[PDB]
Ligand binder design. Structure first.
Ligand SMILES: Nc1ncnc2c1ncn2[C@@H]1O[C@H](COP(=O)(O)OP(=O)(O)OP(=O)(O)O)[C@@H](O)[C@H]1O
Ligand SMILES: Nc1ncnc2c1ncn2[C@@H]1O[C@H](COP(=O)(O)OP(=O)(O)O)[C@@H](O)[C@H]1O
Ligand SMILES: [Mg+2]
Ligand SMILES: [Mg+2]
Lengths: 88, 48, 1058, 96, 571, 96
């Protein structure tokens, strides 16, 4: 149960990823529950959790699958620059 | 005496500056043409 | 102008320097003379065979009949089966004839192999064919198997690709089972390894291809070599770019592991060449930009002229190379091209722009800048720039250059793929599985484990594991692949690991390998029986499991390595493990000698020997003369040249060639001494901190942690040594009491918590060694009289000896907290005293045994008095006299070195209290010498004084005048200069001299022979560390007994009589 | 490192100690509410503390980061909701 | 004196910017002569001051890059107010910092939901600042006023143009002070709604210096030649992807100098340049020196060569062109006339530059198929959109790679090779397998790309722009409500005409909506914030290290009080 | 050297070994008289120890350093018993 990650470019509206509210940059994400799956797709956005807003490959922590189910492609979020920031 | 020594050392410089150069040139080219194979060719540059 | 005229006839001359061309053209008549310079003209043709030819008509005319590439001692030989090179007078005409017949033979040989590879086995084929054509043949096979596979998918024959993949796996099992046969020579090894670096990439690709036609893009991407029967010419396709094979004789060359990055890099470099733009791969150092460009050249069979670019390169020097590439038709990568001065690159841009414009228009000839005539362009040119963004060199390239060169950003090559190749190269199947596990461990263990300097979990240690993991796979093939790797991972790393990190490691090893329940170790049943037997010879040695384990681990490394080193803190039992192992190996066949030297104690120049500035004669080196004596195959001596001092960049660099697999010691006078099988190099380093990561990876480091030989073991031994001294009843009683305060309650752990700011920072073992010394020194009276005491009388002596050994280093405020802690744990203490009364004031009397306040002896005025030279008996002097008497009267032992340093504040009566003790010495019975250290004092300054002060000799051994037992006071011991590495050079001589009882003579005549002083005591006095004053080395602290001199509370007793 | 520098900056202005090259840089930074480069990066170039631009925000994190470590260390039980930002090696935590 | 000491503050920003005192005195003396002559002595003085400020600003602003253009006119505005008692060093210091020193633990709790934690510490800094020539803090009880249940304060922060609307509860007292009132009305907008600082400064500069300073000058090359003499050369500062050599020749045609000497500076081009310049000196003629920053040794020599001691013809004008370089010879900068030729860096202005330059009528006729001209636009449209992403910073591209026109040329040259092989083969559409096209245009541009998540972004742009339905007419990339709404099509040409592409690029809007890059409307608030933090960071470096700040507290005493206030909060 | 002299009282290998016996010859007649009129011929090791103490009693080393010089602070750290062992009289700035 990680806390205090901030979606840049996007908001979380409980139906997956949703378009950000006007003049409200860095919308806060709810409690992320991280585990292991043990290894063993379309309409699931493999978002990168960054240590800082700078976003270089040094400050990449890990990638998080964010559902994005309804009326918005995962490729549309990549263009919107969606990414989970620890710092700001 | 000083003006004559300056004139002397001026002409010494002109000689010695030219000498070290002519040596180096000569030192570079002494192996080629004394050597047989390049000197076999360039008969004109061998005679010089 | 004539030279430039020959240069234009055989372009490759452009890549040779003017002296070497002039040498070759002058020696054009005698073609044997040219043989040295063949390796500059062409690639991988080091030496050429010269036959007798036309021996009947126009004789003494030699003919060239085979091309050799020589690697070390072995060669790759492609004979010219027809197309002999008859070698005429004019060198540049027969050299052209040789480059022509080279290619024309390879084309003939490669043609007849790309036919053979289909109707001959892969084990059978690769053995017959030369490296370059085995590689080319294997590649031709694979691209036929895929093509044919995909062709049958397009016609809808189901599982037609799965059938071809199965062949591609057979082809790969063959190549891994040819790595297991260990064929002779460095050529056939580099031949089979390059085949395996390819066939993992061939398999990897065609394992996850998924294409339903030959023309589908995921296949077109892939580098494909095929032999076209219609144009009878090998053509190498990448995407849409179909180059012919150049047929340069590359011989047997190392190939880099082909990553999915490298495949995508190859496409870019190809797309550049097709569009006639240059290529310029730009990445951080160690990605092998140069090597990947070369690998593409070697894939197309074309010579790649590397030119190590620098500041010294001018626009003329560069223009010469480019006029070679265009006229020759060879590629030409420029290693570190950023490092060229920006001035040059503006002129080079016009050279490259002029070449480009000619290639785009397909011009047969173009005029180069600063050239009067138009020069011939070969269409198959290329030019590449290996740059570095985040430059260590100069600013980014000019605006003109950017346009001409198509970049490839090259990341650091994924480590898993490097390992996967290297595991295949050894002879393992299921490489993909292992290589993931093996990576995960080393990537994770680097983060989780403590960042210690001797830990290397980079590629250096990884490649080291895989050669040892391989040597184990060849011998036991039937054994499970995971267990062999898991075992070869374990046995190498376990030695290195500190005691805290062994449970962390064994956890990671049991995380990533949960299938493998338990792995059996190398029993070594011969040596394991001797260690107990050998230990019980010496009275003072106790055998713990965690100690016996570390002796085995030193022997495990001693067998495989020749440069094994023994890391660990001070008093860890490193020197004793050495001595035991050798005393075991002596009793199992061959005897084993150790030669302890301190490399820091002596100057680098004086250790290895250097050329004398006066009389121009060579002075022997100290190490060289030990090494030369040590390396002789006579009477199976097998000596171990140990280097007790700390490793530094300065002195190991000269010795670096010995540690490596060459095993030859260079003195830098043109003398190279070979290392015999019998002799070995050791290092008793404490830290290994200030040493390069390269030199560490060479040596096989065994770490000995504090807990391997605990202080509990040292105490238990000291008590064992008392019982062997003929006094069992005493030892039995000192046991019950020593255990009660030291092991049962962890008093040194409790003290160290409650008391803050100790004036000198000492380890817990050092404190215990000092206890056992001082506890000896007190009871040394009752040994002489054979007087056993009660448990009350010992329990006073022990708490005295504890108080000064453990709590001596503490200042006045902490002495009270220490004394208050003895009251909490119900030790015997003085019941009655004054305000600010401590244990430290009192002592336990010999005559009658109880706590007595230690009043100083009453002063006797020394006739005529000068206040300046008037030293009186004082409370602080008494306690110092008393303690110094206990350490210095003792007989030399394993615990004691008869030496007692006293730390203390500036002007706290250190120097006085020693000079008060150093009087009242019978001149006949004892002597005294004072040598004041300073920042200037080097080891040769100190060595020269002690050597002069004891000249009397008893046989080999030296001594002070007569046999006096001189006590060498070293005032201001801390002062000598601490260097950048944090190692005091002159104190590493002091330590050597106290420990080993000697040093190595530095007179020119006699080198590599020890001088050993028989009877010397050593007092020291230093201002306590901190506040920009030097701390003494931790290693040295262990030799000395250490107590803190404190300013008096009342100087009434001192100055009141005066 | 912060403790050391701050104490020296109070001494250096008063004239108790000579101004080192690192202390002059730290005094300049603290005036204009930027983090002294000494604290962000070590001489080698490796990152030693979290990279925030402002001093005020950098100082709140130092308190908040330390609180989550200290409240975990002193108490037996670990946080129910971990603050991933607060760790120096969050990649190391997740592998943990 | 103020203005010149601004020009010394600008020298610290960039080495190329530094102008001599001797160059300033020419501007200062000229500003006296050229000014309007008034009979009244005060009006005459007023007329010189107005003319001086501009005439020097005009001169300096020419030799400044677009990022440091607005930074300079803000430094000049402070340097004018810092001389009078209107602004102190502490006032200038506030605006730059504005409670980024304060930590929330030590100070008050936020208490308000709609303010961010930084916006509140910015408020707190205003609440504790006394400004200049005032007894108590102006903004004391602001955090009381904003905490009050008044929607007027929520509305003002939520407005699109906050700096244009009046401050909800404090407006009445801001209008009473004329000189400082404009600066405290700026400090409020820097504190709350930081992102609108570059736009708030223009409002401030216009109330301090006059309207004429906010307006763009945009100097033509005829003016740059008219300003220049024979003895004083014309230095051009080149940002990467700029070349003014064409624009010189354009002017040279009207002046009858078109066939002029050009010399790409390098190693062993010094001997060429001398021979060329000695012709120019006597005969007359223009001399364009390219990439001058590379051949530094000649730049020290050319200063003394082009001096009045050597005989120079009146016609002869020297033209240097060089990208900015540290350890450029100062002597030359102090003689030359410094201009900056920077790309206009819009999407229209970007598209225009590619279709005017590297695309020609020759180029769009190379393959001779509709689907080549269609693809020529899509690669050139994608090119600009990938450049204008870099404006938005780390959201844009994790790492900013200067994508040269070489990347565009190559990606186009590829499509010739590809289409020619499909043109050779017997709705009249080629196969144009876009799977391949994606990969190769994400291999030509992929050369620059170091980051793996920036790669995945470009790859994603490929899949949105180079899809199979671009060849059909009724496809429009992004139909955005920019102004009713612009379509952002592929322009359709029956007959291939470069004019009809350049004609459509006219109709494209100047103000690029963020929706064109697939970003949200809030992307501009992240862009605006970055270019305003960049402005504040550049003007912070210029600030003097003088202890006398004002308000009875030195620079070292402010540091002391903070260093002591930190040590007690440390754990 | 003047540090070494002040702490030890003697420089090692300063004067020739033959020159010792000449010097110590003159010293002897004062030594025998000073040590409560001993009037016995001393050994050459017991004569030195008096001569060294006779050197120190007589030989004074006045040093004259500047506190503002950066070397001054280094010399105190670098040479122990050059600052500690000699009485430091500090020269204040001149009064009215
Ligand atoms: N097995 C043992 N049982 C009892 N005492 C031991 C044992 N091994 C070593 N000691 C003793 O403990 C001390 C350890 O010294 P030793 O030289 O063996 O360690 P070391 O790590 O080489 O020390 P250093 O490197 O600091 O000189 C010595 O007093 C030694 O005799
Ligand atoms: N027992 C003593 N009788 C007379 N003076 C003493 C005695 N002990 C110390 N002192 C004086 O106190 C000082 C201590 O300094 P010193 O003896 O050189 O020791 P340190 O090594 O601490 O400098 C000297 O000036 C010495 O004369
Ligand atoms: Mg040892
Ligand atoms: Mg002393």
């Amino acid at each position: 149960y990680i806390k205090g990650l901030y979606l840049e470019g996007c908001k979380w509206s409980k139906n997956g990823l949703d378009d950000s509210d006007p003049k409200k940059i860095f919308a806060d994400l709810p409690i992320l529950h991280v585990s292991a799956i043990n290894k063993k797709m379309s309409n699931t956005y493999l978002c990168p959790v960054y240590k800082y807003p700078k976003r270089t490959d040094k400050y990449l922590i890990f990638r998080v699958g964010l559902p994005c189910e309804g009326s918005n492609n995962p490729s549309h979020w990549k263009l919107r620059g969606v990414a989970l920031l620890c710092s700001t | 005496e000083v003006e004559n020594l300056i004139r002397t050392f001026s002409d010494v410089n002109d000689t010695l500056d030219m000498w070290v150069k002519v040596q180096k040139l000569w030192t570079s080219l002494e192996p080629v043409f004394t050597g047989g194979d390049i000197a076999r060719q360039m008969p004109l540059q061998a005679k010089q | 102008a004539y030279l430039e005229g020959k240069r234009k006839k055989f372009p490759r001359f452009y890549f040779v320097s003017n002296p070497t061309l002039l040498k070759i053209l002058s020696q054009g008549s005698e073609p044997t003379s040219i043989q040295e310079d063949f390796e500059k003209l062409f690639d991988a043709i080091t030496k050429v065979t010269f036959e007798s030819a036309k021996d009947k008509k126009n004789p003494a005319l030699k003919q060239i009949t085979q091309i050799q590439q020589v690697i070390g001692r072995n060669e790759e030989n492609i004979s010219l089966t027809g197309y002999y090179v008859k070698c005429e007078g004019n060198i540049e005409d027969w050299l052209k004839k040789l480059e022509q017949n080279m290619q024309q033979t390879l084309k003939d040989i490669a043609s007849a192999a790309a036919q053979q590879v289909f109707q001959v086995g892969l084990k059978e084929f690769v053995s017959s064919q030369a490296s370059q054509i085995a590689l080319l043949g294997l590649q031709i096979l694979w691209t036929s198997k895929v093509n044919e596979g995909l062709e049958r998918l397009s016609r809808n024959e189901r599982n037609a690709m799965d059938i071809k993949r199965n062949e591609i796996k057979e082809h790969m099992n063959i190549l891994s089972s040819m790595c297991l046969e260990d064929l002779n020579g460095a050529v056939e090894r580099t031949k089979v390894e390059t085949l395996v670096t390819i066939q993992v990439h061939q398999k990897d690709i065609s394992m996850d291809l998924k294409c339903k036609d030959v023309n589908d893009f995921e296949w077109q991407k892939q580098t494909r070599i095929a032999w076209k029967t219609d144009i009878d010419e090998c053509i190498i396709s990448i995407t849409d770019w179909d180059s012919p094979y150049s047929y340069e004789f590359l011989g047997a060359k190392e190939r880099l592991c082909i990553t999915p990055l490298t495949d995508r890099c190859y496409i870019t470099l190809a797309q550049a060449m097709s569009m006639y733009y240059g290529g310029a791969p730009a990445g951080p150092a160690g990605t092998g930009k140069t090597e990947t460009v070369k690998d593409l050249g070697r894939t197309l069979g074309v010579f790649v002229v590397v030119t190590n670019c620098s500041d010294q390169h001018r626009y003329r020097d560069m223009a010469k190379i480019f006029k070679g590439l265009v006229q020759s038709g060879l590629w030409g990568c420029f290693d570190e091209f950023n490092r060229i001065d920006l001035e040059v690159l503006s002129v080079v841009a016009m050279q490259v722009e002029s070449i480009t414009t000619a290639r785009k228009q397909h011009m047969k000839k173009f005029m180069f800048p600063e050239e009067e005539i138009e020069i011939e362009l070969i269409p198959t040119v290329s030019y590449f720039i290996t740059m570095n963004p985040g430059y260590a060199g100069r600013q980014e390239l000019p605006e003109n250059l950017k346009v001409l060169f198509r970049g490839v950003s090259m990341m650091v090559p994924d480590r898993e793929i490097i390992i996967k190749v290297k595991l295949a190269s050894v002879g393992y199947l299921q490489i993909d599985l292992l290589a993931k596990k093996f990576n995960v461990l080393y990537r994770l263990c680097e983060e989780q484990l403590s960042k210690q300097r001797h830990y290397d979990f980079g590629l250096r240690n990884i490649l080291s594991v895989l050669r040892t993991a391989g040597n184990t796979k060849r011998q036991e093939i039937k054994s499970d692949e995971e267990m062999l790797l898991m075992r070869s991972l374990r046995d190498m790393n376990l030695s290195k690991l500190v005691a805290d990190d062994i449970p962390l490691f064994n956890g990671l090893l049991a995380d990533i390998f949960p299938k493998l329940k338990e792995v059996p170790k190398k029993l070594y049943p011969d040596v394991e029986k001797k260690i107990p037997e050998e230990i019980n010879a010496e009275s003072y040695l106790i055998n713990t499991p965690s100690f016996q384990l570390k002796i085995i681990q030193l022997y495990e490394t001693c067998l495989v390595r020749h440069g094994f080193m023994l890391v660990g803190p001070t008093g860890s039992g490193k020197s004793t493990i050495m001595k035991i192992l050798t005393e075991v190996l002596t009793k199992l066949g061959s005897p084993h000698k150790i030669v302890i030297m301190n490399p820091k104690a002596i100057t680098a120049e004086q250790m290895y020997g250097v050329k004398s500035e006066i009389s121009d004669d060579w002075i022997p080196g100290v190490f060289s003369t030990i090494w030369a004596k040590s390396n002789n195959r006579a009477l199976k001596h097998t000596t171990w040249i140990t280097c007790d001092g700390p490793v530094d960049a300065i002195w190991i660099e000269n010795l670096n060639t010995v540690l490596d697999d060459n095993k030859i010691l260079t003195l830098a006078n043109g003398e190279r001494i070979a290392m015999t099988e019998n002799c070995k190099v050791v290092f008793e380093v404490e830290n290994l901190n200030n040493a390069s990561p390269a030199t560490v990876s060479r040596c096989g480091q065994v770490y000995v942690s504090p807990t391997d030989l605990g202080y509990e073991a040292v105490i238990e031994g000291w008590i064992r040594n008392r019982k062997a001294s003929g006094r069992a009843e005493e030892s039995d009683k000192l046991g019950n009491i020593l255990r009660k305060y030291l092991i049962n309650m962890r008093f040194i752990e409790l003290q160290s918590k409650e008391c803050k700011e100790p004036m000198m920072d000492t380890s817990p073992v050092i404190s215990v060694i000092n206890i056992l010394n001082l506890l000896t020194g007190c009871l040394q009276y009752f040994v002489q009289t054979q007087r056993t005491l009660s448990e009350q009388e010992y329990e006073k002596f022990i708490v005295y000896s504890m108080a000064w050994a453990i709590g001596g280093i503490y200042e006045a405020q902490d002495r009270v907290r220490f004394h208050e802690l003895l009251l909490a744990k119900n030790a015997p203490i003085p019941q009655k005293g004054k305000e600010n009364e401590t244990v430290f004031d009192y002592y336990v009397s010999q005559d009658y045994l109880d706590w007595k306040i230690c009043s100083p002896e009453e002063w006797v005025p020394p006739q005529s008095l000068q206040f300046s030279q008037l030293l009186l008996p004082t409370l602080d002097s008494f306690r110092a006299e008393m303690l110094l008497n206990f350490i210095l009267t003792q007989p030399k032992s394993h615990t004691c070195s008869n030496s007692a340093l006293l730390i203390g504040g500036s002007g706290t009566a250190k120097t006085s209290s020693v000079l008060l003790y150093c009087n009242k010495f019978d001149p006949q019975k004892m002597l005294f010498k004072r040598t004041n250290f300073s920042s200037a004092t080097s080891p040769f300054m100190f060595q020269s004084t002690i050597e002069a002060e004891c000249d009397f000799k008893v046989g080999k051994e030296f001594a002070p005048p007569g046999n006096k037992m001189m006590t060498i006071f070293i005032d201001d011991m801390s002062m000598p200069f601490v260097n950048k590495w944090g190692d005091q050079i002159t104190l590493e001589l002091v330590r050597q001299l106290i420990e080993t009882g000697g040093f190595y003579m530095l007179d020119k005549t006699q080198r590599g022979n020890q001088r050993k002083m028989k009877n010397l005591q050593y007092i020291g006095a230093m201002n306590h560390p901190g506040g920009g004053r030097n701390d003494i080395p931790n290693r040295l602290k262990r030799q000395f007994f250490i107590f803190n001199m404190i300013l008096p509370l009342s100087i009434e007793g001192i100055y009141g009589p005066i | 490192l912060v403790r050391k520098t701050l104490q020296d900056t109070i001494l250096a202005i008063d004239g108790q100690i000579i101004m080192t090259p690192e202390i002059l840089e730290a005094i300049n930074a603290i005036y204009d509410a930027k983090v002294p480069n000494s604290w962000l990066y070590d001489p080698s170039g490796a990152e030693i503390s979290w990279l925030l631009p402002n001093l005020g925000s950098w100082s709140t994190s130092l308190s908040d980061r330390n609180k989550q470590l200290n409240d975990w260390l002193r108490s037996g039980q670990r946080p129910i909701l971990f603050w991933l930002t607060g760790f120096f090696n969050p990649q190391g935590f997740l592998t943990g | 004196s103020a203005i010149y000491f601004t020009m010394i503050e600008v020298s610290l920003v960039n080495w190329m910017y530094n102008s001599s005192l001797e160059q300033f005195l020419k501007l200062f003396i000229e500003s006296i002569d050229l000014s309007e002559k008034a009979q009244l002595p005060s009006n005459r003085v007023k007329n010189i001051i107005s003319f001086l400020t501009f005439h020097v600003y005009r001169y300096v602003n020419r030799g400044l890059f677009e990022k440091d253009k607005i930074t300079f006119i803000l430094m000049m505005a402070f340097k004018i107010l810092t001389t009078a008692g209107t602004i102190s060093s502490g006032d200038v210091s506030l605006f730059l910092k504005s409670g980024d020193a304060l930590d929330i633990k030590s100070e008050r709790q936020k208490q308000i939901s709609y303010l961010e934690d930084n916006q509140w510490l910015n408020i707190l800094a205003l609440s504790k600042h006394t400004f200049s020539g005032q007894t108590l803090p102006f903004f004391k009880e602001l955090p009381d006023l904003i905490s009050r249940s008044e929607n007027q304060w929520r509305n003002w922060i939520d407005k699109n143009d906050p700096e244009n609307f009046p401050i909800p509860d404090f407006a009445e007292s801001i209008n009473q002070e004329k000189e400082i009132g404009s600066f405290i009305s700026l400090c409020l907008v820097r504190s709350l709604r930081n992102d609108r600082t570059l736009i708030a400064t223009q409002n401030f500069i216009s109330n301090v210096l006059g309207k004429e300073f906010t307006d763009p000058i945009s100097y033509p090359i005829e003016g740059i030649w008219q300003e220049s003499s024979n003895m004083d050369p014309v230095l051009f500062l080149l940002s990467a992807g700029a070349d003014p050599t064409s624009s010189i020749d354009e002017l040279a045609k009207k002046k009858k100098k078109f066939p002029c000497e050009k010399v790409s500076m390098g190693e062993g081009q010094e001997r060429v340049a001398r021979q060329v310049i000695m012709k120019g000196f006597v005969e007359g003629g223009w001399v364009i020196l390219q990439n001058c920053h590379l051949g530094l040794k000649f730049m020290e020599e050319i200063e003394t060569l082009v001096s009045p001691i050597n005989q120079i013809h009146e016609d002869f004008r020297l033209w240097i062109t060089c990208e900015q370089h540290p350890k450029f010879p100062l002597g030359l900068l102090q003689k030359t006339l410094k201009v900056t030729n920077e790309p206009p860096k819009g999407l229209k202005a970007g598209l225009y530059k590619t279709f005017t330059t590297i695309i020609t009528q020759e180029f769009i006729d190379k393959v001779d198929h509709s689907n080549w001209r269609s693809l020529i636009f899509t690669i050139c449209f994608l090119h600009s959109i990938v450049i204008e992403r870099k404006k938005f910073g780390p959201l844009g591209w994790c790492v900013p790679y200067e994508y040269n026109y070489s990347d565009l040329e190559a990606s186009l040259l590829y499509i010739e090779k590809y289409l020619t092989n499909l043109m050779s083969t017997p709705h009249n559409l080629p196969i144009s397998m876009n799977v391949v096209r994606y990969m190769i245009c994400e291999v030509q541009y992929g050369g620059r790309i170091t980051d793996d998540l920036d790669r995945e972004l470009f790859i994603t742009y490929g899949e949105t722009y180079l899809k199979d339905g671009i060849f059909g007419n009724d496809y429009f990339f992004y139909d955005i409500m920019v102004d009713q709404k612009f379509k952002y099509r592929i322009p359709q040409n029956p007959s291939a005409e470069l004019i009809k592409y350049q004609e459509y690029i006219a109709k494209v809007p100047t103000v690029d909506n963020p929706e064109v890059f697939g970003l949200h409307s809030n992307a501009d608030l992240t862009f605006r914030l970055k270019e305003s933090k960049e402005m504040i960071n550049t003007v912070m470096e210029t600030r003097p290290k003088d202890s006398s700040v004002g308000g009875g507290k030195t620079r070292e005493e402010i540091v002391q009080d903070k260093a002591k206030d930190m040590l007690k909060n440390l754990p | 050297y003047i540090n070494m002299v002040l702490s030890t009282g003697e420089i090692p290998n300063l004067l020739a070994k033959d020159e010792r016996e000449v010097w110590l010859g003159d010293i002897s007649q004062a030594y025998c008289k000073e040590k409560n009129l001993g009037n016995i011929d001393p050994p050459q090791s017991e004569l030195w120890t008096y001569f060294v103490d006779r050197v120190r009693d007589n030989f004074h080393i006045m040093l004259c350093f500047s506190p503002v010089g950066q070397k001054f602070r280094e010399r105190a750290r670098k040479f122990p018993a050059l600052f500690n062992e000699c009485t430091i009289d500090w020269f204040l700035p001149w009064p009215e």
